[PDB]
């Protein structure tokens, strides 16, 4: 099949770590001899099989920045919010970006530790207010509030 051998050869371009020759790539697989693989490599954006000699070089929610993610939170004011999935699909390592855009700039929800921060898309203003001592957290909510009257 054309795709299977082409996939292995194109995957071999980045694995070798070298821009191996156009033909010498095929003999390394020893089975891929079609021109569609060469056509695909020539059609490959990641595999820079340019007009020159054989050169084997490696390469939804387009919000790849905290500036763009902040805009997403701005677009979802009084609106719904996706959790974390397409956010990291269009931008690898959102979680570090979440902490960098802290204090309601990447206002997420750390749903679980093993969930890779299954975030939430919400938009706050100051967000963090972490300076409150957890003792004052203890001291704030132990208060019996009078009812209607």
């Amino acid at each position: 099949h054309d795709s299977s051998k082409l996939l292995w050869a194109t995957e071999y371009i980045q694995k070798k770590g070298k821009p191996v020759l156009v033909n010498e790539l095929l003999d390394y697989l020893s089975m891929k001899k079609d021109d569609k693989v060469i056509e695909l490599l020539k059609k490959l954006d990641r595999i820079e099989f340019d007009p020159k000699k054989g050169t084997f070089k490696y390469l939804t929610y387009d919000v790849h920045s905290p500036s763009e993610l902040l805009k997403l939170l701005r677009s979802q004011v009084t609106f719904k919010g996706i959790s974390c999935k397409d956010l990291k699909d269009g931008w690898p390592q959102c979680d570090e970006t979440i902490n960098q855009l802290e204090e309601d700039s990447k206002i997420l929800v750390l749903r679980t530790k093993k969930d890779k921060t299954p975030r939430y898309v919400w938009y706050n203003s100051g967000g963090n207010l972490k300076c409150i001592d957890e003792e004052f957290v203890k001291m704030w909510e132990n208060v019996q509030l009078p009812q209607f009257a």
Binding site: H1, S3, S4, K5, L7, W8
Partner: protein, 58 residues
């Protein structure tokens, strides 16, 4: 299942059904799941959502 064999066989299976359920494809393979899953990792592009959820793609 060799990586080239997985690459050809999975593509042979993906040519039959690349847009197939991730559970259904494995039962169509029934081999040591590391080989079939690994071939899905480079010789396919995962679509977790949508109508073709968990369906191999390229």
């Amino acid at each position: 299942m060799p990586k080239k064999e997985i690459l050809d066989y999975l593509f042979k299976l993906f040519d039959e059904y690349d847009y197939w359920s991730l559970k259904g494809l494995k039962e169509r393979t029934r081999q040591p799941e590391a080989h079939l899953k690994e071939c899905l990792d480079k010789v396919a592009t995962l679509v977790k959502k949508g109508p073709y959820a968990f369906k191999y793609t390229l």
